[PDB]
Design a protein around this ligand. Structure first.
Ligand SMILES: [Zn+2]
Lengths: 141, 116
């Protein structure tokens, strides 16, 4: 059973980190310097450090050498105990389902609980059900 | 290979059979690399938007499914190494699951995420 290591990354650059290391692996699997990594875990609920799969601590050091996104947490590679290989894959309740209850972030109905009606397949806009709280143009000028 | 890596981070989805995480251009030009004779999602956009959805989370760089602890837990060890997901929510309609049982493909719920 392979071990899991924790490396430090830039905040905001998790998916770019994963999509860059995957292309390094594919860019070096056929040379004289391959990569000894199995996978790299990047949860969407975290922000700041990622997870990597390797048997020994020298493999992560000889695999992440040369990347500028992982140059900060390069001098230290923490190790998790074996019971933490499972809590990493757990996701608590994507988040796109009709007839559900979402809230707003910007606009006038901030932090107001609404409902979803229809979803646009273009992934551009979404239908919402809220209640207007305007004055019907009586108080404002 | 170079085809299973999504080129752009915008408009990417994940399937409900092998949790294949790619961009919307590769599911239409090439499709599901882990199932092409049972799904046939290359050559159109209705079948790509029908089975494969965007409601998914969690990203893993599967490289050696024959030797890794995560690949056996997600039952993705008999698949091609590449971009996969760990919780792909949703369910197939009662229009493509009936043909999968008669052909010998047991459609499993890949959603390992807990509900409340
Ligand atoms: Zn699939």
């Amino acid at each position: 059973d392979p071990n899991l290591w924790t490396v430090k990354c830039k905040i905001g650059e998790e998916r770019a980190t994963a999509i860059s290391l995957m292309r390094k692996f594919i860019a070096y699997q056929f040379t004289d310097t391959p990569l000894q990594i199995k996978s790299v875990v990047a949860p969407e609920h975290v922000k700041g450090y990622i997870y990597v799969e390797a048997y020994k601590q020298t493999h992560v050091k000889q695999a992440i050498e040369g990347v500028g996104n992982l140059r900060l947490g390069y001098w230290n590679q923490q190790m998790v105990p074996i019971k933490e290989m499972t809590d990493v894959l757990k996701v608590v309740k994507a988040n796109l389902k009709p007839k559900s209850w979402v809230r707003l972030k910007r606009g006038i109905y901030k932090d107001d609980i609404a409902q979803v009606d229809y979803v646009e397949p273009s992934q551009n806009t979404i239908s919402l059900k809220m209640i207007p709280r305007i004055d019907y143009d009586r108080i404002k000028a | 290979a170079l085809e299973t890596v999504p080129k752009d981070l915008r408009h990417l989805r994940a399937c409900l059979l092998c949790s294949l995480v790619k961009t919307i251009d590769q599911f239409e030009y090439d499709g599901c690399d882990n199932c092409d004779a049972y799904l046939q999602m290359k050559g159109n956009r209705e079948m790509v938007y029908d089975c494969t959805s965007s409601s998914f989370d969690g990203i893993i760089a599967m490289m050696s499914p024959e030797d890794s602890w995560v690949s056996k837990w997600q039952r993705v060890s008999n698949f091609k190494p590449g971009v996969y997901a760990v919780s792909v929510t949703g369910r197939l309609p009662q229009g493509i699951v009936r043909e999968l049982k008669s052909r010998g493909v047991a459609y499993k719920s890949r959603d390992t995420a807990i509900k409340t």
